[PDB]
């Protein structure tokens, strides 16, 4: 290893905002009511006579895991470059793109608000494509998707596979979903972290406030595609260097097992050798996923 090594993030959303349409104007925000009772109570629900609620966010994808942002060691750099390319030419970006793409179309980024009478998801991109999932309530992590839907997963996978692997393509997606709702259904936006509770909003250009979901909360949902441990797929974990599992309060790739990122980072010379003899194993899939969610890998 070496003293300085960093990657930046290769995939990121902006934030999500809730709103509805009227006959008089196209963008009316969903608002939150507060009573000072400081120590307050507050509430948010769809108001009477609005039949459906809209949620929207934007996504940029960048081929930025091909090269270290900073590296202080010429030998570490030579290897990391050789590895990313050794992988790229055998495929594998398709696999990562398939996993990311599946999560967008499924709709899990809606977290606790998935319980609707029918959710429709529409996607537009900067290359001129449009995708349409008429009903997002039925698509599993594991299983065969119904016809015409399986197909759009392949088409979206292809655009993203490119966005992740070739530079100088400026790829944007614009994701809007519609929630068909109940009579006065409660809505669950992001909460504020404090030292009673408060909810998060954003300001509109006209001064009104609106309910929202934070950027990283959308992001945490998209990248939850780690099921390469213990030969038991279950449900996937949010990619983490130690395999953290918040629900059970544990860690699946505890350093004690030899299965964490840092042990694996030191075997790069051996992986490149294998790729040259090539089948891609779980060990290199994990590593590539972490490099995409870049951060500090230092003080070796």
């Amino acid at each position: 290893l070496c003293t300085h090594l960093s990657y930046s993030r290769s995939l990121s959303p902006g934030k999500a905002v809730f709103f509805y349409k009227t006959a008089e104007s196209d963008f009316v925000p969903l608002r939150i009511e507060v009573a000072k009772i400081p120590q307050t109570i507050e509430a948010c629900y769809v108001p009477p006579n609005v039949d459906e609620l809209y949620c929207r966010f934007s996504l940029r994808v960048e081929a930025n895991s091909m090269r270290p942002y900073v590296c202080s060691n010429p030998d570490v750099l030579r290897v990391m470059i050789g590895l990313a390319q050794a992988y790229q030419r055998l495929g594998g970006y398709n696999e990562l793109a398939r996993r990311y793409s599946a999560n967008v179309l499924r709709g899990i980024w809606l977290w606790r608000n998935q319980y609707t009478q029918g959710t429709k998801i529409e996607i537009k991109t900067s290359l001129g494509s449009t995708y349409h999932i008429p009903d997002a309530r039925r698509l599993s992590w594991s299983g065969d998707w119904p016809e015409l839907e399986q197909k759009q997963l392949e088409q979206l996978t292809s655009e993203m596979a490119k966005a992740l692997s070739q530079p100088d393509i400026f790829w944007f997606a614009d994701v809007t979903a519609s929630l068909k709702t109940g009579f006065c259904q409660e809505i669950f936006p992001s909460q504020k972290f404090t030292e009673s509770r408060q909810l998060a909003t954003v300001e509109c250009s006209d001064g009104q406030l609106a309910a929202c979901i934070n950027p990283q909360k959308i992001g945490a949902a998209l990248q939850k595609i780690d099921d390469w441990w213990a030969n038991d797929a279950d449900l996937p974990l949010r990619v983490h260097e130690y395999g953290a599992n918040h629900e059970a309060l544990t860690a699946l790739r505890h350093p004690a097992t030899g299965q964490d990122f840092y042990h694996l980072l030191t075997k790069a010379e051996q992986f490149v050798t294998v790729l040259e003899s090539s089948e891609l194993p779980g060990e290199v899939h994990y590593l590539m996923a972490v490099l995409v969610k870049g951060g500090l890998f230092q003080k070796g």
Partner: protein, 202 residues
């Protein structure tokens, strides 16, 4: 002209909101046996931060209050060293009164209440024959401090919360207590002495 007795909780881990609810339920049951009675509930350890680890009952009829004290629940809880009980004695003549009014208006702070109110309003319009056209209020309200007590429903499948406020007494009219020995904002006037004094007795 007034008698009282007090109960204190001995255990350091006691949950005041859960436990207080049982004493009120007993009072209610007693009220059902003998409709023509009046017994008030007081919180002599009331604070702005918490409800306190003690409860007291106040009334005017000594012989009746003794009968209440004899209720089996209280006797069991004492025997197992959960409760410390006092005896019935006369209320000191050197104190001030408080109301302990309960406020149901606070229900409107929660989504469940708004939903029910509107559902009824829609249905109610059919008699009028006009289209349902509800009109909402503004975004800011100000309310006073209140504490919660956990309550079970009477012969049903529900549970809910009582919201208690403390108001200072002002004298007028004649009195009456609610089924819980609590005061109401209107047309249920009563008061209790604020016996935070002489509490060294338990």
């Amino acid at each position: 002209n007034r008698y009282f007795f007090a109960i204190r909780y001995l255990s350091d881990d006691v949950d005041c909101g859960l436990l207080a609810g049982r004493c009120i339920s007993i009072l209610h049951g007693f009220r059902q046996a003998h409709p023509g009675i009046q017994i008030g509930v007081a919180f002599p350890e009331w604070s702005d931060r918490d409800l306190g680890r003690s409860i007291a009952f106040v009334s005017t009829n000594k012989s009746l209050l003794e009968r209440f004290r004899e209720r089996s629940y209280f006797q069991v809880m004492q025997a197992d060293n959960f409760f410390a009980l006092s005896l019935v004695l006369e209320v000191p003549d050197t104190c001030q009164n408080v109301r302990f009014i309960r406020n149901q208006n606070l229900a409107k702070l929660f989504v469940g209440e708004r939903r029910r109110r509107l559902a009824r309003a829609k249905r109610r319009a059919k008699a009028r024959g006009e289209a349902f056209q509800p009109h909402m209020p503004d975004e800011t309200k100000v309310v006073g401090v209140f504490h919660s007590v956990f309550m079970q429903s009477a012969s049903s499948g529900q549970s809910y919360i009582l919201h208690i406020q403390k108001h200072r007494y002002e004298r007028s009219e004649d009195s009456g207590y609610s089924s819980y020995g609590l005061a109401s904002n209107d047309l249920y006037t009563g008061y209790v002495p604020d016996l935070g004094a002489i509490f060294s007795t338990l």
